Amino acid sequence: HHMPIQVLPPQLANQIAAGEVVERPASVVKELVENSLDAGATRIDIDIERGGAKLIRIRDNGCGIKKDELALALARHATSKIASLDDLEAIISLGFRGEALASISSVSRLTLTSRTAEQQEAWQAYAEGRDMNVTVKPAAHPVGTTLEVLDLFYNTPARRKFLRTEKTEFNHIDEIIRRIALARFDVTINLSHNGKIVRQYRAVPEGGQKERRLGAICGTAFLEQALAIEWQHGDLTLRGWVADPNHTTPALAEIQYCYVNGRMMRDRLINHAIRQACEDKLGADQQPAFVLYLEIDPHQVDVNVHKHEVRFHQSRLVHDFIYQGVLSVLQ
Amino acid sequence: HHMPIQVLPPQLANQIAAGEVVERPASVVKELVENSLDAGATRIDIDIERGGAKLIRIRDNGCGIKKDELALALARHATSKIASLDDLEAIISLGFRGEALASISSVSRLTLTSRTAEQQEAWQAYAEGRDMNVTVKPAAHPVGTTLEVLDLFYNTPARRKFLRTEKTEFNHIDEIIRRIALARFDVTINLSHNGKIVRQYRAVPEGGQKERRLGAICGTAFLEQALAIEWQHGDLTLRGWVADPNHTTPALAEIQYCYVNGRMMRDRLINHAIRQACEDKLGADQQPAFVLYLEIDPHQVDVNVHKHEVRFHQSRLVHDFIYQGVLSVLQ
Ligand SMILES: Nc1ncnc2c1ncn2[C@@H]1O[C@H](COP(=O)(O)OP(=O)(O)O)[C@@H](O)[C@H]1O
Ligand SMILES: Nc1ncnc2c1ncn2[C@@H]1O[C@H](COP(=O)(O)OP(=O)(O)O)[C@@H](O)[C@H]1O
Ligand SMILES: [Mg+2]
Ligand SMILES: [Mg+2]
């Protein structure tokens, strides 16, 4: 009670928010790449420097951001993805909170450059000062967008001390891209570190062969033991690959990716049902290797938990669904 | 790009926030009880109805909220706990985001009643409408505060469908109070459900016997096997109780509470070090039973992660510290 209840200034408020949204360089990559995806990009190019502690540049060939909305994109609680509660309950995009860019900009030197198809001119924007005032100025850029994040945590020292080695931080970034690339086979994703190419996942044309990308992302080892899955029942449909439990090594066990309507996730309900389907067919219980995609009525699952967490309205039903699907294929 | 980037109205913005802050009735209880603690309360009384889906009332004998700050308490990004980045890096209170009440009020009928020692008059406040306009009116109330949360999720149907049985929801509430009561032995906490008293933990006077409350919260079973711990090394000090691994049952295994400077938490680093100290002394590896308190330089740990998660600057050091402390006592 000694200090009055007082509104937190823009920058400070965003930095506090950044504490949750910006865990490490990998977090920034995730947020930006997901924005490119929402913007309908077909190709995303990612350049990293020193594990991302020095630089993170992500360019996409998405639809871009209109000049008069650049500042809004750097603003808090402002989005183009939902306008009401209905939109949220049945969301189509990955984003909707309208907080990511604002948060990131408050704890780094973030530059937003973009041009829409209707604009002849490209523009660049960035916020500054305790009030996060935005400067918009001329720039050069093709249809699409480029986010440039420099000196992450430069103005938040307590956090900068927690940054691990360049090697460790880049690895988390590599892992993040790995999870996103598996979610969208139709999107070309290139990742580079310190001026050198680390990877590039070619987009798979309509109906093209996926085994190619799967192997490129997860490795040939997984690709060989990969058992495809096709299991449906109304709104519930399970797809993907499950490695033969009998031929699953701990190295392959590193591949445990699950998705709910394209949204990457790590839910215990699912990991359990799978390990159950394997333990029940196989002899011993162990860490299975898989890449599964669950399609379900968006109204039967909560995506606003805070991101890899989700909540299923019919917990039991879903769990048994996945269990059967995997169990079935394992036999 | 079809829909413009647009600011989310106050109520909607808060409801989206509520998706993360308000997981279930237990979340509301946690936020409110922690506010009472920050306000210096010595006694907190909690009344629940129908698992909290119908009513949640929390009254404290804290310092209260000044009339002219009631609306600010229901506002977003407004707090009395930090005013800058320094304050955050070495925080003293549990709160600091200034978002909890605003979020909760947007997804329930929340009434805030309070009176400070300097005021002869008590006042009541609550927000309404898409803009969250606040109404302040006369009320009766002793020094302190009472939060009243009714019909949780009444205006967010998609979420209301996820509410479990009254029994299940109250249980999470009981568990939450359990964790908070262990964090503060000096605070009397009474919990009631549907007009009937479920529990009441008496505050322990200065230096009074703690075994009494420990047993009342964790049960006599744990109290008997409880092995006290006193282990320090500079800023690092470990205290609490660890149940004899050899006499630990799965029922006792339900008691795994760890705290960093009074802030409840569930960090794997610690749970691992403990289970390691037990596995290494004991024969088999298992689920230990414990109530440990780690005191550490606030600058060596990050509390703004999003709450039971924390991040230690010197991960390895801390882990070995706890391991030794427990290991030592187990012998
Ligand atoms: N690469 C991009 N291409 C096009 N629009 C983008 C891009 N990145 C961000 N935006 C715009 O900025 C707004 C989002 O910023 P963000 O802070 O990520 O919030 P959110 O995605 O939850 O709405 C989006 O709603 C969209 O309108
Ligand atoms: N029970 C209470 N007694 C006194 N002050 C309170 C109480 N509950 C809330 N407040 C005030 O309301 C503001 C907090 O609301 P909240 O949304 O919980 O945010 P935070 O605790 O993170 O600041 C506090 O900063 C404090 O000034
Ligand atoms: Mg986004
Ligand atoms: Mg609070």
Curated annotation (Swiss-Prot), chains A, B:
Transmembrane recorded as keyword: no
Molecular function GO terms recorded: ATP binding; ATP hydrolysis activity; ATP-dependent DNA damage sensor activity; DNA binding; identical protein binding; mismatched DNA binding
Keywords recorded for this protein, A-Z: ATP-binding, DNA damage, DNA repair, Nucleotide-binding
Keyword Lipoprotein attributed: no
GO cellular component: mismatch repair complex; single-stranded DNA-dependent ATP-dependent DNA helicase complex
Single GO biological process annotation from the record: mismatch repair
Taxonomic superkingdom: Bacteria
Purpose: This protein is involved in the repair of mismatches in DNA. It is required for dam-dependent methyl-directed DNA mismatch repair. May act as a 'molecular matchmaker', a protein that promotes the formation of a stable complex between two or more DNA-binding proteins in an ATP-dependent manner without itself being part of the final effector complex. The ATPase activity of MutL is stimulated by DNA.
Family according to the record: Belongs to the DNA mismatch repair MutL/HexB family.
Protein name in UniProt: DNA mismatch repair protein MutL
Species whose genome carries this gene: Escherichia coli (strain K12)
Parent-protein start and end of this portion: 1 to 331 of 615
